[PDB]
């Protein structure tokens, strides 16, 4: 019986989406900053909004939230995804290639590449799942 109405959720989302810098993790400070930067006509409504704001702060620390979107998160995530390995996972010494794709490459005049190892095709022709 403690589900939050869309008023509280939406107000918390807007406050978090605009004023991320000011708020923290302690409910007794989120309530004060919220009542400072917002017109909340009731103490109980302010308490509910600040509690959900504290819950949202506990939610974001473990990862980006679906309903929360600010530019700071976008830049932080682009910093996070600024990861490049030492060796490319693509190009290695030996890559297996089937005889048919080997013929396709020799048609393209790239069939003389030495990185290619001509593997043998499947022994049989069992690739359809049984019907029924």
């Amino acid at each position: 019986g403690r589900v939050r109405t869309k008023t509280v959720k939406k107000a918390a989302r807007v406050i978090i989406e605009k004023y991320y810098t000011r708020l923290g993790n302690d409910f007794h400070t989120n309530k004060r900053v919220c009542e400072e930067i917002a017109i909340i006509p009731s103490k109980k409504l302010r308490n509910k909004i600040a509690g959900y704001v504290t819950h949202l702060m506990k939610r974001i620390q473990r990862g980006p939230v679906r309903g929360i979107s600010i530019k700071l998160q976008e830049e932080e995530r682009e910093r996070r995804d600024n990861y490049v390995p030492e060796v490319s996972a693509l190009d290695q010494e030996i890559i297996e290639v089937d005889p048919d794709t080997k013929e396709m490459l020799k048609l393209l005049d790239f069939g003389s590449l030495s990185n290619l190892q001509v593997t043998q095709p499947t022994v049989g022709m069992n690739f359809k799942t049984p019907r029924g």
């Binding site: 490319s88 996972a89 693509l90 396709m104 790239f110 022709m125």
Partner: protein, 213 residues
């Protein structure tokens, strides 16, 4: 390309394709993707003619370049396998990304918050990106798609024939498209290899990042 040897396909590009499994399609073939397939394997897998892949990638890059406002190109990915690739493409090339769920009415509902009017649309998979594609049919939107052998070609104007199932292949195709578009624009040269590499565009499972941390 147009038989322009400066635009011809390189040995390194072929090796990248073969390593990412780009040439490897599925076991089913849409009748409109027949012209892009070389031959079926002994295990029912269709091999994608990478010459046609390069031709269609260059055609798509040419279409992208002929939009002098780069933000008027919209790059869409609903699957996680192409979200990071789409974001990297948008960052490098200046396009507008939609990574995640595409809200219906984005192209059609003028009142919506995410309403936009792109001039060209690029998607990772026509099957998984069917919603923007359909909306493309409402606002005169040309469409580029990375199409597998069984991809449906409805509302797809430039279909790039490539494996779009594996993360490696999707990332490599988006990286190659960004490289080609930049090379045609003028920024970055066609002589030395691009300083960025495909693994930036790839997608890593959350378990992979946990392993890397």
């Amino acid at each position: 390309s147009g038989a322009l040897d400066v635009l011809q396909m390189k040995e390194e590009d072929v090796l990248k394709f073969l390593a990412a499994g780009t040439h490897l399609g599925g076991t089913n073939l849409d009748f409109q993707m027949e012209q892009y397939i070389y031959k079926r394997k002994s295990d029912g897998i269709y091999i994608i003619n990478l010459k046609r892949t390069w031709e269609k990638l260059l055609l798509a890059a040419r279409a992208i370049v002929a939009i002098e406002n780069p933000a008027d190109v919209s790059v869409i990915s609903s699957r996680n396998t192409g979200q990071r690739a789409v974001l990297k493409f948008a960052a490098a090339t200046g396009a507008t990304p939609i990574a995640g769920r595409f809200t219906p009415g984005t192209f059609t509902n003028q009142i919506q918050a995410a309403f936009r009017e792109p001039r060209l649309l690029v998607v990772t998979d026509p099957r998984a990106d069917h919603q923007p594609l359909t909306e493309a049919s409402y606002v005169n939107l040309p469409t580029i798609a990375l199409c597998n052998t069984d991809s449906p070609l409805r509302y797809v104007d430039i279909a790039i024939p490539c494996n779009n199932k594996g993360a490696h292949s999707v990332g490599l195709m988006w990286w190659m498209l960004a490289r080609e578009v930049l090379r045609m624009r003028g920024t970055i040269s066609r002589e030395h290899p691009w300083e960025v590499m495909p693994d930036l565009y790839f997608y890593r499972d959350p378990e992979e990042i946990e392993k890397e941390e």
